Design a protein around this ligand. Structure first.
Ligand code: ZN
Ligand code: ZN
Lengths: 315, 320
């Protein structure tokens, strides 16, 4: 009167849970949304050949919730669904090697993801969630569908939406081990005196307002709260890299003075990112396309620099 | 001879300048504006001494000032803001039913109902520019707020606007972080699937005007081919906005906060605003009409909210 097969369910592909399913009910009626080898089988009834196979499901009990938390480092019950929704699209993208880096061929307004992925491959960073570390290793090998889908899911963005590199890195850095990173700034006003500040973690590696790391060390003019103008400069830096960002204008990149950079062009509300990396010369990676030149000038928005330990000699 | 003036991108940080009356403002500052009017090709006058002029964010410091005030990095923003402001400063902003409206001009009806709506829902803007201008607009000086909405939406004065699109852009610049929405979709073949939305997506819905109908269930396609039922499980927000393609719809006193009526089509049309107070009021630019009931082609309805949790049991969804 009820026929069954044995299957395995999982939210992480590591902890497998035996389930006996009724062959007259769909997987969705028994599990909720269900996937077999990436394929959506929610509307399907079980087949004899499915016996023994592993199905991804969403976490709808305490056991699966704890396992999702330990793998993704999220308590949001919608995370896996939104990740699977992104993954439906990113699994169709192509991820060619371009000058030895995994890129992404243009699809679905994904240029900001391409330059973020290329950047992550050139700065020293360790991700805390096992799912993000695991997917990053796979991305490095040219299978970046899981990693891109996770990026979208951790930024709560959907495929096709406009992405911003600065916001994207900020979300990802929040899931990286940047706790030891340290930054000390000093701000001097001719009338108010000087004020020092110490930043840790993500705030210690990102700055908004200047693209030049060397200008940041020499001092930048910023509005002072007294209404006058003041000079802010970097006193100390402890981090494996720094990310310098600014509202775009026209900026010149020169070989050997930076690690990599992002350029933003086209319609501002739905624009296009290109990646520039410094190797033996400058390479402009534009999705699957490659060009090379001695220098590069354009609307740069983010520049990444290598760092270890810096202390100023100023004052 | 020469005179001292102030340049600015945000009207907070003022940069002292000396200009000469023999050259244009443009030769000295680049593109330059005085209360929205383009004075790039104008020579300074005696009577300009001490006035504050907007300039484009043409070095790193000014680009930081513009970013901190407007929360955009678009280099075209300031020019577009000024171009709109040169017009919106000439609009009239009468008080209608205790609310700041806009007298009709330049196809601005969508901005009027957006402005009237913002004065009736709880919303905090993140950009200082929008915060400051909203407060001024609440008090009746809405020219800068209206010009900023145009700039943020990449719309020019005179262009046909869309209220739903306009609110999307404004909500994008509002603190909606803690807003949350949980939905359930039930298919007889596929079972249940729950979805959670945050931010702008948690307060906006396209497909039905009726908040009550959203709670009770709406029919949608399922990828298996049958129709499924989508309904609201949980809502945490100070308001919700329900939108639909325009259709004849009856608004009843006490059942909604305010709504937008649209007459026209995809190329050209006109919006009016309907608010529920002691009775229903249709604010049509400067014009006020009071009615016990209202019937019209409604496209957006706003409702007050705080915390909602469904009492539907999935197993009973179709007992209706
Ligand atoms: Zn000061
Ligand atoms: Zn179905």
């Amino acid at each position: 009167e009820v026929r069954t097969i044995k299957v395995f369910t999982t939210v992480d592909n590591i902890n497998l849970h035996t389930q006996v399913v009724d062959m007259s009910m769909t997987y969705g009626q028994q599990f909720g949304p269900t996937y077999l080898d990436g394929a959506d089988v929610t509307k399907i009834k079980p087949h004899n050949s499915h016996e023994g196979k592993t199905f991804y499901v969403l976490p709808n009990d305490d056991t699966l919730r704890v396992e999702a938390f330990e793998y993704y480092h999220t308590t949001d019950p919608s995370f896996l669904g939104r990740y699977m929704s992104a993954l439906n699209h990113t699994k169709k993208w192509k991820y060619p090697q371009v000058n030895g880096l995994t890129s992404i061929k243009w699809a679905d307004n994904n240029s900001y993801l391409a330059t973020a992925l290329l950047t992550l491959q050139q700065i020293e960073l360790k991700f805390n969630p096992p799912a993000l570390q695991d997917a990053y290793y796979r991305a490095r090998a040219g299978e970046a569908a899981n990693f891109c889908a996770l990026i979208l899911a951790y930024c709560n963005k959907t495929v096709g939406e406009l992405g911003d590199v600065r916001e994207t890195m900020s979300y990802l850095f929040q899931h990286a081990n940047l706790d030891s990173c340290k930054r000390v700034l000093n701000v001097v006003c001719k009338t108010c005196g000087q004020q020092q500040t110490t930043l840790k973690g993500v705030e210690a590696v990102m700055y908004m307002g200047t693209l030049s790391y060397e200008q940041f060390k020499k001092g930048v003019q910023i509005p002072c709260t007294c209404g006058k103008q003041a000079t802010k400069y970097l006193v100390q830096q402890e981090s494996p890299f720094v990310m310098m960002s600014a509202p775009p204008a026209q900026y010149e990149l020169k070989h050997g003075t930076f690690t990599c950079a992002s350029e933003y062009t086209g319609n501002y509300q739905c624009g296009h990112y290109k990646h520039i990396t410094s190797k033996e010369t400058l390479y402009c990676i534009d999705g699957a396309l490659l060009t090379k030149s001695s220098e590069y000038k354009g609307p740069i928005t983010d520049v990444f620099y290598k760092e270890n330990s810096y202390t100023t000699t100023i004052k």
